[PDB]
Amino acid sequence: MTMMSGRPGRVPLQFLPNEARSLPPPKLTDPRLVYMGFLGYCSGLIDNAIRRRPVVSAGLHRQLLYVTSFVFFGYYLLKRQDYMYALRDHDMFAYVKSHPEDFPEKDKKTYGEILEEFHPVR
Amino acid sequence: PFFDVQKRLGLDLDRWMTIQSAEQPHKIPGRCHAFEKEWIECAHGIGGIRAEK
Amino acid sequence: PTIRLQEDPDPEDENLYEKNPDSHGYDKDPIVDLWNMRVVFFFGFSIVLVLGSTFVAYLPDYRMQEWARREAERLVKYREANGLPLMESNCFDPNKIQLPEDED
Amino acid sequence: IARTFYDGPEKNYEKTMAILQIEAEKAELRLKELEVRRLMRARGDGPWYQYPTIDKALIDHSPKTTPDN
Amino acid sequence: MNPIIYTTLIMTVMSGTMLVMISSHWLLIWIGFEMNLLAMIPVLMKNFNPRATEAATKYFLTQATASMMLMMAIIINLLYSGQWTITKMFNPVAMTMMTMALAMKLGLSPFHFWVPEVTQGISLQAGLLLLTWQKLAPLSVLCQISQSINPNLMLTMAMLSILIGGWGGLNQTQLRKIMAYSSIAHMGWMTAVLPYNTTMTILNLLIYITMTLAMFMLLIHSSATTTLSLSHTWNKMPVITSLMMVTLLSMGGLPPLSGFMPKWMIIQEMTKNESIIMPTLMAMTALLNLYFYMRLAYSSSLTMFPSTNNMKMKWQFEHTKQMKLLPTMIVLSTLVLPMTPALSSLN
Amino acid sequence: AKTLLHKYSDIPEGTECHRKAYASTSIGGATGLIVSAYSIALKPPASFLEGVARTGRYTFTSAAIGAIFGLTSCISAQVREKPDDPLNYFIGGCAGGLTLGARTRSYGIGAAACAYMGLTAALVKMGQLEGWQVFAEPKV
Amino acid sequence: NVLQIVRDHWVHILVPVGFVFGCYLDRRSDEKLTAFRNKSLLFKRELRPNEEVTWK
Amino acid sequence: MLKIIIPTTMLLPMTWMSKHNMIWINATVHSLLISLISLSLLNQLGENSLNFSLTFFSDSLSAPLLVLTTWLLPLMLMASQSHLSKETTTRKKLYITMLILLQLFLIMTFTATELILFYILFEATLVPTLIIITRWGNQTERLNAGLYFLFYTLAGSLPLLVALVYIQNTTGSLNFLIIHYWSHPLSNSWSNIFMWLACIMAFMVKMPLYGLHLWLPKAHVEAPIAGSMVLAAVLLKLGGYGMMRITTILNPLTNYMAYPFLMLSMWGMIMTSSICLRQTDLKSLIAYSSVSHMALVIVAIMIQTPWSFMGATALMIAHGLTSSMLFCLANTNYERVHSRTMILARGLQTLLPLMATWWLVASLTNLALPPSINLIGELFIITASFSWSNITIILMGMNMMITALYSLYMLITTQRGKYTHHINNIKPSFTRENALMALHILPLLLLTLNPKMILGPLY
Amino acid sequence: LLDLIWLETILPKTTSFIQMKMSIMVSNQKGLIKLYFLSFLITIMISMTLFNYHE
Ligand SMILES: CCCCCCCCCCCCCCCCCC(=O)OC[C@H](COP(=O)([O-])OCC(O)COP(=O)([O-])OC[C@@H](COC(=O)CCCCCCCCCCCCCCCCC)OC(=O)CCCCCCCCCCCCCCCCC)OC(=O)CCCCCCCCCCCCCCCCC
Ligand SMILES: CCCCCCCCCCCCCCCCCC(=O)OC[C@H](COP(=O)([O-])OCC(O)COP(=O)([O-])OC[C@@H](COC(=O)CCCCCCCCCCCCCCCCC)OC(=O)CCCCCCCCCCCCCCCCC)OC(=O)CCCCCCCCCCCCCCCCC
Ligand SMILES: CCCCCCCCCCCCCCCCC[C@@H](O)O[C@H](CO[C@H](O)CCCCCCCCCCCCCCC)COP(=O)(O)OCC[N+](C)(C)C
Ligand SMILES: CCCCCCCCCCCCCCCCC[C@@H](O)O[C@H](CO[C@H](O)CCCCCCCCCCCCCCC)COP(=O)(O)OCC[N+](C)(C)C
Ligand SMILES: CCCCCCCCCCCCCCCCC[C@@H](O)O[C@H](CO[C@H](O)CCCCCCCCCCCCCCC)COP(=O)(O)OCC[N+](C)(C)C
Ligand SMILES: CCCCCCCCCCCCCCCCC[C@@H](O)O[C@H](CO[C@H](O)CCCCCCCCCCCCCCC)COP(=O)(O)OCC[N+](C)(C)C
Ligand SMILES: CCCCCCCC/C=C\CCCCCCCC(=O)O[C@H](COC(=O)CCCCCCC/C=C/CCCCCCCC)COP(=O)(O)OCCN
Question: Does I29 touch chain E (CB under 8 A)?
Fold first, then answer.
């Protein structure tokens, strides 16, 4: 039930291994970063609304800090998520390569020589 | 769930007491020291699923 | 108190015509009302309906209907000039079909 | 109208081809990933589902007051 | 209670949980549970009254029985294998006893009886702590021994928890009991996917904790513990009732809200294991939780209830104490579905 | 115990109707005993004889439902010569629901139970035939 | 004289700017799906002496 | 496709930053402009769809529905501003926000390439509708209506979700193009039967199918006018569109799994048309007429022929326009007299002649007068059904009769006879109401000149 | 007979009635720990006999 916690050579609490540096970092105009900044902006607006302040105008420094914090955390979150997916595919490809008898390459037939049952609509 | 702080820091908070074959005072051996030593050396590093078989 | 609660009485609905005899039914403010009528009429009847209907009417033939008619004309001409049947019951060439060898 | 607001059929045709290729590759990757997960969870010979055992460096390999360990 | 003593007790509760979640030795996990309970009892009685005393007594009896069972399971496991490490239980009887002890600690059915009463008997801050922080340690232990759990027993308890949470929540006018039954149903959802994928368990735990923190903070802000008391909030703080209604919709699991993401991820995972009947029943039963959330939203925000004259005075005063993390909590409780793939960072 | 379930399921569908009925009666009686135990624990009967009477009532109702279901399903299977057909289970379950309605002396309960138990039993038969898993093992 | 009318009518460019931005993003998304540009068996063609791509 | 989505999203800050007396003008003008822009999706290809990107695609089935949604938003705004005048600025902006969010969800729903995204947006449309009904409805029943609107939908859609993820575990994809190209037959098994039911019953509930339709009269009667307009014109079609997408994986099972639904649709079409003959509430009559038309659409989709699919598309568009117009017509009289009883206000042709003309044209399109697209769709479906089995005409023709009988009945009850004497507050029709009726009726008539634009992919 | 009575009776009214009765049965516990802990003992015995004997 625990897939990748026991992966060999895994440091307990790094959050971002050294090998993850081999991957292209997310662009700063990444749509996911833009959505994280939007979440920070919404948090700032809700903070104004709860405190009974002018929602759009009250805390520009506070709203800016909300947006900046959300973007800053989202960058490293995206890096870690991309690294984990890269690890998943790396392990999958290595396992398929090391077990050819479990993933055989079978000759594929053309449609002119496969017999498919025809079901009339009437 | 299990935040493995001990191995990250090399602290050894409670690992000295987990098994029977680990550094007893005055080198007093457990009743089944050899069997546990053999089983641990058999199962080391191959994973629980493979070790069960 | 022979009463259950302190409540405002239900007010009577007010007629927009009373203060604005030509009120268009858009807003209480006459200027906002007139401009709301004007923008509705201009952007629905003048822009969307007329110009949109013209645009849809002159859409280019991406469905390729005249193309299909011309292709059919060419095929009919060629086929009845050489005595070929106008259409074949087989959509695909049988020579590229591999039926199972034995049916019994 | 065609010149101003639209493109030729080639663009949509080949964009469809690219989209179809990406989608088919994703489908085959998903099926292969499920099969790999099943095999690794059944046999335990892969990097995944590697459940901890006892570290062998905890064993004390010193004389034990008794010759028979 | 003295504020320094209160801080010490809170940090002792947290330290017990951390001891549970960093230990590799069964005895230290047991000690962490004992320390957590010992520091937890006075926090429930911080506001002294007969109801708080009764809640603390019921809680202590339940948790002490669970701790006895847990130590018994540890000792049986040691007897059949001279092992103290928390890897995988070697004796099935010990495993059954451990699963029952952890279910009793979590409040899963049929050991759910204490969860509403205690939650009703304590203050809202104590209820927040009890329904959020107290779930971490048993769930972490369950995640560590997931491969050893018998799926039939765990799934039976999970389905019972979902059913009983929905049915019990249908009958409640008090908000603390509503939150307790919601907690029982969510715990059932969490423990249903545990034998298949612990990452889904962690994701559900995080999402539920975020939404529960949002709701408890909103209930503390508008100091309401009953439905009728909450029906006055529209006439003093309409924004609070609007946010509460959106968070309630999220808790019911309706898309595109965040509360939909855990169930969506769990059902899907179960279908990878040829499990269709249980996910179908689970969703159809979570409909009940949605129903009583919707009833609360009807009474609180979607309609306007009659108010009182003295409320006019409350119009002249602001809230003295401000909650720093409430806006972030609300936003995380509602608008995080588009960031679903980030869950890969949890494994 | 699933040993009783195996004892029921080891006998083929439309054969030995008396033994099928006996096994289903045992399963129903066990279910009724568990229900009565929980009911007595959570709602004490204020008397020992009244508790014994309630246990007897619940256990007899459940055992009668089990006997009726098993006997009706086996007889329908053997007479129609159609084993592995969910409609035998539907008929047995709906007869069991009618038995429950008669035992509680309620027409509406009888009809609702007949329909719901019949549908549930037919679904169980379909799951047996197609291999549907309630507690799926962690394959992946 | 234009300051106040701008301050009360600047909301009238939000939707046209949205339309222009959406068109730009559609073009950008188009740029990521050129793997088969001038490569289909039906439309494959020799380039003109001056053009660099068949479509963009 | 983002050239439609982003302006719709921009509608939100535009209405939240507008002056208190400018919200309606700005929202109406810019929604009309968005509809004009969306009108360019009608240029369709034939062979295959317009595939903008990996996420969104447009078909000859999707484009008319998208245009109808974008056109319905300004009409809803026009119809809402009368009874929302006394509302505060913030609550008016919140109402407009609900309408904008509903349009955004529907636009994304009709163009999603992948079935899980379609499902998520399909469920997301629920929340704004529920809020609109239960917050701005007039009567105490609205709350109950909301519950009926909710749990009927979810009880159908939760199984579908399960089926969907199950499919992606075995097929490997839920992209509609991949699903269509790699489609395989369904064998005759109990598991396949239940997967078919899980794939179909959510759209069945949404139609609604006869017997699962009890939520619709409640929800449509208790809703405010914009809620009723969007519920009848667009939301019901979410079922039909969904079916037309998902039946591609259900062959050849649909060959016999469709019999109970066909029987329910034909008989319940007769039943709901007959119910319309004895109805005291004017909105309830319109709701039941919608049920009957949607039953005919269900028959068309279930028999799985090109003529039936074309007829179903045309009938969906035509019914959306006609039912929205009828709801607006009833709401004008309701705002006059504050009652929905059909016999309270009579002889209205004497007092409101132009509104009587609008009533007449709406009633004519409701009974499918040639050459309106209502009859185009109805006749195509009837011809396909006759090919399916010649006895169907007996039911179909019967439905036609009953339809006319209730349509004119409504017209005769509210417009003809003598006026009620004591009702003396019937003011002349406003320009807003007449313009709303015209903006309903003229596009419907113009669609007769170019019917193929609504005939769907099978054309 | 059909829309206002029986179609209401079968799907929505039956569901509401069944859920309400189940809610009343589940939530009507007097709060006495004797009964709860007796049910706990029954549950522990059942789990030891029906799940723990089958492995
Ligand atoms: C490792 C994990 C495992 C751990 C567990 C292991 C345990 C091992 C040790 C066991 C030895 C026990 C030693 C000391 C225990 C202390 C008990 C105590 O202090 O009592 C306090 C408790 C309260 O004391 P009180 O408040 O001062 O007095 C109040 C009055 O008593 C009442 O006043 P009232 O008049 O108002 O009330 C009316 C009356 C009402 O009384 C009743 O209604 C009960 C009568 C039910 C009739 C049962 C039907 C008869 C036939 C069933 C046989 C089944 C097979 C048949 C098959 C089909 C037949 C054809 O009383 C009650 O309400 C009490 C209800 C509780 C009854 C017993 C609870 C057990 C579960 C509930 C189900 C009861 C049976 C239902 C059927 C289920 C299957 C048997 O006393 C009692 O409740 C009654 C006396 C208890 C004495 C006997 C206890 C021994 C049983 C222990 C467990 C049994 C075996 C465990 C496992 C075996 C297999 C592995
Ligand atoms: C989606 C589109 C629309 C569809 C949806 C809408 C329609 C669906 C629902 C419509 C209504 C169906 C409701 C079902 C029954 C509800 C009963 C009830 O509410 O109980 C509460 C209600 C409350 O009772 P209570 O509070 O306990 O005590 C006070 C009583 O009022 C005091 O009662 P009492 O003292 O006055 O007398 C009671 C006593 C005596 O009752 C009387 O006093 C009067 C006599 C009544 C019996 C009438 C039989 C003679 C006529 C029937 C002819 C044969 C059937 C049709 C065959 C057609 C041939 C071409 O009752 C009995 O003993 C009858 C026992 C069994 C005999 C009838 C059962 C036959 C089942 C049908 C088999 C069909 C097989 C498939 C055929 C396929 C080929 C066509 O019970 C009643 O009062 C009703 C009693 C009558 C029950 C039998 C009537 C059922 C008729 C057929 C049902 C089949 C439809 C459902 C099929 C799916 C099921 C799996
Ligand atoms: C409602 C949405 C969720 C909100 C959750 C709260 C957000 C605030 C959390 C603050 C972030 C800091 C936490 C971690 C920082 C450094 C610590 C790091 O080293 O820990 C690593 C762990 O990394 C963390 O898990 C990453 C946390 C990121 C959580 C985001 C996932 C959310 C799901 C998708 C929804 C989108 C959320 C949007 C964000 C605002 C160690 O890995 P490991 O010791 O081996 O794992 C232990 C458990 N195992 C072994 C059993 C697996
Ligand atoms: C001679 C008289 C008869 C002529 C009638 C002509 C009919 C056409 C008129 C109707 C207008 C058509 C509706 C507009 C929909 C088009 C939207 C979209 O498709 O156009 C985009 C292009 O944008 C266009 O600019 C659309 C702008 C249309 C905006 C309409 C606003 C009109 C409102 C009128 C306001 C007047 C003043 C108001 C006073 C208050 C395409 O994006 P792009 O990817 O680049 O193009 C790809 C093709 N390329 C590569 C060849 C370039
Ligand atoms: C009130 C006063 C009454 C008295 C005065 C009356 C005056 C006369 C009125 C009657 C006029 C009758 C005109 C009859 C039509 C003649 C012209 C007609 O045939 O044009 C058609 C063209 O019609 C258009 O194709 C269809 C118009 C579609 C309108 C769409 C409106 C925009 C959408 C609005 C929102 C809709 C929302 C719902 C959408 C589903 C023909 O198309 P086609 O023969 O092929 O074209 C061949 C030549 N082309 C290709 C170069 C054009
Ligand atoms: C209010 C409106 C709600 C919506 C209504 C939706 C309608 C859905 C109904 C589904 C239609 C058919 C379902 C399955 C197809 C055949 C069903 C069965 O009766 O046919 C026979 C099936 O044989 C038996 O009859 C078994 C079915 C009997 C048990 C089911 C209980 C039916 C009682 C009615 C319950 C009410 C259902 C609706 C509840 C609301 C055919 O025999 P056979 O060809 O050999 O087996 C075919 C299946 N194989 C191929 C997999 C082997
Ligand atoms: C408004 C009310 C609408 C109510 C809709 C309810 C009906 C929905 C349809 C059924 C829902 C669940 C179906 C599950 C999704 C199908 C996916 C699938 O293919 O799984 C099947 C499994 O199918 C099932 O297990 C489903 C059995 C039913 C479980 C729940 C029973 C609920 C009541 C059943 C009848 C009601 C359904 C139809 C109601 C019609 C609408 C009223 C096969 O998978 P495997 O296990 O791998 O087997 C392969 C080898 N054969």
Answer: yes
